[PDB]
Design a protein around this motif. Sequence first.
Motif, PDB file in Angstrom:
ATOM      1  N   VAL A   1      34.812  36.437  28.444  1.00 41.20           N
ATOM      2  CA  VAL A   1      36.191  36.013  28.200  1.00 41.20           C
ATOM      3  C   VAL A   1      36.670  34.999  29.204  1.00 41.20           C
ATOM      4  CG1 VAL A   1      36.793  38.147  26.959  1.00 41.20           C
ATOM      5  CG2 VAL A   1      37.327  37.892  29.438  1.00 41.20           C
ATOM      6  N   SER A   2      35.843  34.656  30.187  1.00 38.76           N
ATOM      7  CA  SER A   2      36.113  33.575  31.121  1.00 38.76           C
ATOM      8  C   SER A   2      34.765  33.023  31.593  1.00 38.76           C
ATOM      9  CB  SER A   2      36.903  34.097  32.329  1.00 38.76           C
ATOM     10  OG  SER A   2      36.047  34.796  33.226  1.00 38.76           O
TER      11      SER A   2
ATOM     12  N   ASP B   1      32.866  35.239  34.040  1.00 36.62           N
ATOM     13  CA  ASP B   1      31.950  36.257  33.516  1.00 36.62           C
ATOM     14  C   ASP B   1      30.523  35.713  33.465  1.00 36.62           C
ATOM     15  OD1 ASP B   1      33.995  38.113  33.018  1.00 36.62           O
ATOM     16  OD2 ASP B   1      34.095  37.628  30.875  1.00 36.62           O
TER      17      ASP B   1
ATOM     18  N   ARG C   1      28.879  35.682  37.002  1.00 36.71           N
ATOM     19  CA  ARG C   1      28.405  37.007  37.396  1.00 36.71           C
ATOM     20  C   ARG C   1      27.088  37.321  36.710  1.00 36.71           C
ATOM     21  NH1 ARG C   1      34.195  37.484  37.865  1.00 36.71           N
ATOM     22  NH2 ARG C   1      34.596  37.662  35.616  1.00 36.71           N
TER      23      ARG C   1
ATOM     24  N   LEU D   1      33.768  29.519  24.038  1.00 36.90           N
ATOM     25  CA  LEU D   1      34.859  29.998  24.891  1.00 36.90           C
ATOM     26  C   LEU D   1      35.667  28.820  25.422  1.00 36.90           C
ATOM     27  CD1 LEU D   1      36.369  32.098  26.607  1.00 36.90           C
ATOM     28  CD2 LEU D   1      34.413  32.002  28.197  1.00 36.90           C
TER      29      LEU D   1
ATOM     30  N   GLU E   1      39.594  28.022  24.861  1.00 34.86           N
ATOM     31  CA  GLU E   1      40.515  27.889  25.992  1.00 34.86           C
ATOM     32  C   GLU E   1      41.190  26.520  25.965  1.00 34.86           C
ATOM     33  OE1 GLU E   1      38.215  28.483  29.449  1.00 34.86           O
ATOM     34  OE2 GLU E   1      38.317  30.655  29.441  1.00 34.86           O
TER      35      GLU E   1
ATOM     36  N   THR F   1      39.935  24.212  45.266  1.00 33.92           N
ATOM     37  CA  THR F   1      41.271  24.257  45.855  1.00 33.92           C
ATOM     38  C   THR F   1      42.165  23.255  45.179  1.00 33.92           C
ATOM     39  OG1 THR F   1      40.348  24.895  47.974  1.00 33.92           O
ATOM     40  CG2 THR F   1      42.625  24.041  47.984  1.00 33.92           C
TER      41      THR F   1
END
Lengths: 333, 333, 333, 333
Positions: B2-3, B6, B9, B303, B307, B38
Amino acid sequence: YVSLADLERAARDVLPGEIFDFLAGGSGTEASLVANRTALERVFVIPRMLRDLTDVTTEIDIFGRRAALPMAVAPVAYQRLFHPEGELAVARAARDAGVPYTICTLSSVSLEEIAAVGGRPWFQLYWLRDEKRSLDLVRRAEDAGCEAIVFTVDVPWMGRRLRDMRNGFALPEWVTAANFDFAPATWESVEAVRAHTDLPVVLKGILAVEDARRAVDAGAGGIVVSNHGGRQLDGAVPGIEMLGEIVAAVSGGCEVLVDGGIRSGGDVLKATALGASAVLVGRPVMWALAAAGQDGVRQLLELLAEEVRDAMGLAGCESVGAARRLNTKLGVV
Amino acid sequence: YVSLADLERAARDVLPGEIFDFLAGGSGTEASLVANRTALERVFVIPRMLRDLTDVTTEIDIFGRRAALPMAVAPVAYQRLFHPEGELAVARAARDAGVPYTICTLSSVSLEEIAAVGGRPWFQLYWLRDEKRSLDLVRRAEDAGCEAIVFTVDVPWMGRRLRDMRNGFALPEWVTAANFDFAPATWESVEAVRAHTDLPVVLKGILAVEDARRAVDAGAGGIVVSNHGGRQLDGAVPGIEMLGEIVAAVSGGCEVLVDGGIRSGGDVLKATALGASAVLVGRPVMWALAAAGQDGVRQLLELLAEEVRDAMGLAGCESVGAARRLNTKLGVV
Amino acid sequence: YVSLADLERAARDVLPGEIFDFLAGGSGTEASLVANRTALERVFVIPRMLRDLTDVTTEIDIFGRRAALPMAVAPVAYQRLFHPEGELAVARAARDAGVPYTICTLSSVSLEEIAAVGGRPWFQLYWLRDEKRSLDLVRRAEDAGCEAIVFTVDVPWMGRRLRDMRNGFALPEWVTAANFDFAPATWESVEAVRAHTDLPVVLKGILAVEDARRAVDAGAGGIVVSNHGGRQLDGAVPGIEMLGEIVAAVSGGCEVLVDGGIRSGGDVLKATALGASAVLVGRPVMWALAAAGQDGVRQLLELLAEEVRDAMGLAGCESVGAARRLNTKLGVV
Amino acid sequence: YVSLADLERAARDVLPGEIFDFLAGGSGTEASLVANRTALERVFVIPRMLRDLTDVTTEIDIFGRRAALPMAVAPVAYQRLFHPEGELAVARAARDAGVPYTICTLSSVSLEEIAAVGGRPWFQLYWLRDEKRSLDLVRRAEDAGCEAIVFTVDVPWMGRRLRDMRNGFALPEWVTAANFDFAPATWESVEAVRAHTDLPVVLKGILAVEDARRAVDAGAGGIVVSNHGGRQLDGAVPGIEMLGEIVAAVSGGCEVLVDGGIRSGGDVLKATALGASAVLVGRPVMWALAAAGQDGVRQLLELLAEEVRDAMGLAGCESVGAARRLNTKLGVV
Ligand SMILES: Cc1cc2nc3c(=O)[nH]c(=O)nc-3n(C[C@H](O)[C@H](O)[C@H](O)COP(=O)(O)O)c2cc1C
Ligand SMILES: Cc1cc2nc3c(=O)[nH]c(=O)nc-3n(C[C@H](O)[C@H](O)[C@H](O)COP(=O)(O)O)c2cc1C
Ligand SMILES: Cc1cc2nc3c(=O)[nH]c(=O)nc-3n(C[C@H](O)[C@H](O)[C@H](O)COP(=O)(O)O)c2cc1C
Ligand SMILES: Cc1cc2nc3c(=O)[nH]c(=O)nc-3n(C[C@H](O)[C@H](O)[C@H](O)COP(=O)(O)O)c2cc1C
């Protein structure tokens, strides 16, 4: 409770985690949710001293009625998620505190039942499928005694709330959209509403200066400068950061409210010093509802009233109008 | 997923640590790698409301072809490091998503094999030993159907990647530079390429405003405003911080792309609101490749497409061109 | 060693804690010590691309002699605290690297012994009791072949180094001020030195713009813009933050060096892009000395040379003069 | 003790937690308490070099008397909370150090007893119930030999100190308001005081520029630019952030003092470089009192004197007036 954060702690203990997450979360990375707080924390007030405070009042007149504080309860859908009495508990406490309560299109108790509690109900509109159904909802609210139409304009569709996605969050069977037995709004929708009610139309979710000006030109009686609590566009600027520029551009042509992260009377004072007419408060009201029902919301509103009076007097302001003339200075946190 | 986080990871779990480090790392202290993130996190969008979204499209035209999103897969060398199908898996997914794929000079599958997948291949050039070999590589790419030459201009030599030094990282024997059986580029090299192809030449790694202007004067069809993912000069400004000034200076004379740290559709919207024509995405594509091969890259692109559509509509933009007219405000994180 | 921080880690392992603290510490709360690093970390370089790098040189001419890098070893007192060979080890490595070495008034080996190593020795002056003794020290340095007088002007007395106070730090009996068998300097002292040597006089510890201008008017051949490594006034601005304004005000009337927190070739590039002629490096040289004696200092200087060459070429600079014409942009860390 | 923070650590060990909290705390979220420190930490001094320091003096003339440092002990109520000798211990140490001591309206030893210690006592006024009682308190202070009236103008009522609320803090039976056997002040109250004493009237708690100007117009001999240590309005700007603008607006018409977070001689130098005539110091004096009684306060004042002399000389200032002409630069921490 001596701060609104005491209520947050109480609500986290009682609510199921997925319901706490539905309440607390934002869209995406939650950048806009966090920024609402960061932005308020950067604002410092320049208080005035030695002014007459013998009749300090926190009251304002807005949309034709006196309110006890420059604050209303923000629209929060599905309040029975947080307590069995849901919207009726919150509306009763708001009425008794003299604070307007915003009834949601997606309320879990019908708008007519909530309006029958009394007080100063406003009605929040999400634009429906067709103009006819949307106008029938406005007419229901007006017939029930709602005093303003808060047309939410930042939800062409709902944002991507990753906590809810990850949790697989769904409404329990015992919580429904009680006003029912949506399509994206446009400026044409605003005009349709304006032409079909004498109530003030308030556009909630304005952030661009030119949209605030267009709202005045469109006949809005107010706007709420808001990023929807960081739940819509992730990366949308906080309302508090656009407020001063928007207040200057509308130059009194409508009421300018703000929301997002208001968590104390001092935050109310900051919003007013930046030029807001009033604030909305969302999540803290639901923390109080979850923690202790109607009495919890009453205690929250009493605490906020004390904090607003305290902050105003410490800043030399005997009225909200004087607070709007305070200057501010941005700092670092 | 969902991002995009994910996928990060997932890739960390599967890849050997030294390969994860080759992918994730930057040069020196990694100051520029961190600054790319940043800088994006400091940008907030000022969304517009109430606009017609009945035909919201994320498509753009660039370098003579429609693309489904304002995005291309960045050049990343040696993709077989991350999955056995390497570049073919990524190129297939990009083709199916309607996203251009940049074939690298240092690809681990030959450029002709990757081009045979179809789609919209671009070709990234590292300048070789002599003009003749470099132009023969450009001609191979053009003969194979590549649509643009992405000439990387920020690598007179490779930066000092301390993670790779500390790990003693080397290519496994089973990964090779499949286009082969380098010298620093100059403006003369750019002219040699421009004179020897009809394809648009895109200079990747421009940060100074005067180099962007010179790129237009030199006949470039585009530039990529980029610090090479923080892998070249440690301390180089993020591309996203130079983008607005560069877009103003070129004033439409070429396409202006940006890369570095794009990790969501909201980040794409930020880049477009700062004036980019399109973005490149590098590391996340390799996370998806490592995690799940072709299907992983497909899921990443689906995804990102969702988005980007979500962020555009929430911001009131029915097209990428409208997104480029959004204003932004810098905040603090 | 692949970064200067590798040397810091090595020196912490070997040195007694109180000696590490004498080296690492600053005055007061160490606000200025930390700010030297913060300030460098906020500077980002805007590199140039596509320039001719076929003869990239890091050499400069300063005070009448070529130096291999735009760098000199800063004056650090009592180098036998860190290694038995003390100043001789450092001076030998600096000579072999083509880097000027600054001999201290408070050296733990006599200035004539260190000068006999060869290389490009400079001599740092602390003003003594009377003009006559101070001028005799200058004359010793000149007779021994020192090439410049680095008159330290920020020590009317020594700052309050709380680590040393808390540790009760004292020199071991085996470390002495080997030039001996102090009073605050003024502009009159500077004139006395200038009148009594033909060597260039360099004022170390200038931070105010008007003091830089007065230094030029006083006949200084250079200044070092410096807060003394955060060891003098706690709360003094970092030299790197005054550098650009000072370079503009002197407008070529003297060499403008900077020190404080230079920890890589990229930091050298930042200093030069802000307008410095050269930097001094202090603590890292002592880390290398402590870790591995002369060979350690050699390795540090080889690493710095590689990092400076790397950063210059990545930024499109074939000479230090080109690096001084780079632009910079401040960021957030 | 080598810093004021050493005294804080000592006082935390000895005092009961609820008394430490009464001393340390602020109102609300403590945003203004923390900001007093943040603001000082952002200020950096630009020191001057090479000036004559042969007669460095920290003395000032203020309100008709010489003081040994540009500092006075701030009014802190109920000093017997911290040590059995309370105000007498602090006043004795201040007298012996040549520092003015401010006697509080809410002192736990009578103002006449504290004044009998000698030294330079000032008297802090909280406005009472009626003008007559308030003026009788001023007349008591004047008859007892107090030299200035510090009229606190930021307390129409006391702020909301959540640590004290949570602790249920109350005065022990052995601590009383010894001047007794309050109503909000206004500009009329200031005029009543001014008309009924020849002593200089100093308004403590001014933050708005126009209130500083009005204070001069009202006949004040000084102001203290202050947010009351973050104990009154939570979100009030730090005094140190308004100081420069206030000093410019009054343009010598009264003494301009500052307080809030002064924790070293370097902080005194920062305040003077921003234009303050002098500072007040509150909490650290009570840390010293709690830790070691009169001798503790003596040690604190000796340390502060050393730190002020050190900072002034390192910055090239032979007098406080020279320190007021120093420039500053804001940094990031
Ligand atoms: C759980 C939840 C439900 C909400 N429901 C609505 C809604 O039905 N209509 C609306 O306009 N805003 C809705 N909002 C947005 C709020 O009105 C408000 O803009 C936002 O929460 C920011 O205020 P806060 O930080 O005080 O919560 C909702 C917010 C939350 C957290
Ligand atoms: C492992 C790796 C290999 C790369 N290889 C190339 C390359 O061959 N050519 C090129 O121009 N850039 C190359 N790049 C830079 C990328 O194209 C891109 O500029 C950079 O990674 C920033 O985008 P990101 O933050 O989305 O990864 C590489 C980057 C990585 C991480
Ligand atoms: C242990 C130590 C001793 C120093 N001794 C001297 C000295 O004798 N003369 C001088 O002008 N500066 C002296 N300095 C200051 C350095 O020359 C230099 O200005 C400072 O350390 C900042 O550079 P750095 O961050 O690279 O260490 C000393 C610094 C340290 C850490
Ligand atoms: C425990 C306590 C008691 C105080 N009592 C008084 C008071 O009686 N009158 C007054 O004007 N200010 C009072 N103050 C405010 C101080 O005079 C001062 O403005 C403040 O503490 C900021 O200075 P500091 O950071 O050095 O403590 C008090 C402060 C503290 C912490």
